[PDB]
Design a protein around this ligand. Structure first.
Ligand SMILES: O=C(O)[C@@H](CS)CCCc1ccccc1
Ligand SMILES: [Zn+2]
Ligand SMILES: [Zn+2]
Length: 225
């Protein structure tokens, strides 16, 4: 039922209900010769929607807003990028032009400026040190320390016990490290434990790529790194 990579043509976006007020958006994009699926989060925020990450590109993100408009019908007013890679910030310009206020930690914003990626407009205070947490509307943002990247944040929806781990967290079927050029391998396992120790009542854990799982996904990631 969860959409797979061969089912989403590059340019299209699917929405998947995870609990109500919480959806994940799935898009596809090529990366060094191959196409991969990628997840993001959507959270109902009163009469508005909070977006967690872009759909990996300008055209995909445009498709995302259109799909949101078609299936949910509420405006996306804010977005948070969980790290500096293009599958997280690629498309913030389309979001900006659509009236969406974009956010990211200052760490993410400068890591994106130096790599030449799109840069979220606003800086998120209170997450510069491992273990820091801040609330942001219907969700709580957490900076566990360097893992997939040195700036990676994870997101938690209290009212739904949904833990969005981003690309610091791997799906279950993934048994190899893959690309970790921007990671801190030595610290990764420690950052994940910080996540474990911080959201032990998580019911759903969404990886940055692939199928949903449980807290089950954390140790699996450590074991793969
Ligand atoms: O820039 C990067 O290093 C990554 C963005 S998270 C590319 C992700 C592509 C991919 C996603 C999941 C598994 C293997 C490859
Ligand atoms: Zn990444
Ligand atoms: Zn990723």
């Amino acid at each position: 039922e969860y959409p797979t990579v061969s089912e989403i043509p590059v340019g299209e976006v699917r929405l998947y209900q995870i609990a109500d007020g919480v959806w994940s958006h799935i898009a596809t994009q090529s990366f060094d010769g191959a196409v991969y699926p990628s997840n993001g989060l959507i959270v109902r925020d009163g009469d508005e929607l909070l977006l967690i990450d872009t759909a990996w590109g300008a055209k995909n993100t445009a498709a995302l807003l259109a799909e949101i408009e078609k299936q949910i019908g509420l405006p996306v007013t804010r977005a948070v990028s969980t790290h500096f890679h293009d599958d997280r910030v690629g498309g913030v310009d389309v979001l900006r032009a659509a009236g969406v206020a974009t956010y990211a930690s200052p760490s993410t914003r400068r890591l994106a400026e130096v790599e030449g990626n799109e840069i979220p407009t606003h800086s998120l205070e209170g997450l510069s040190s491992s273990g820091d947490a801040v609330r942001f509307g219907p969700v709580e943002l957490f900076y566990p320390g360097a893992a997939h990247s040195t700036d990676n944040l994870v997101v938690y929806v209290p009212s739904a016990s949904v833990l969005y781990g981003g690309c610091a967290i791997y799906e279950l079927s993934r048994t190899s490290a893959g690309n970790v050029a921007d990671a801190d391998l030595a610290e990764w396992p420690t950052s994940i434990e910080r996540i474990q120790q911080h959201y032990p009542e998580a019911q759903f854990v969404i990886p940055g790529h692939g199928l949903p799982g449980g807290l089950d996904l954390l140790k699996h990631t450590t074991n793969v790194v």
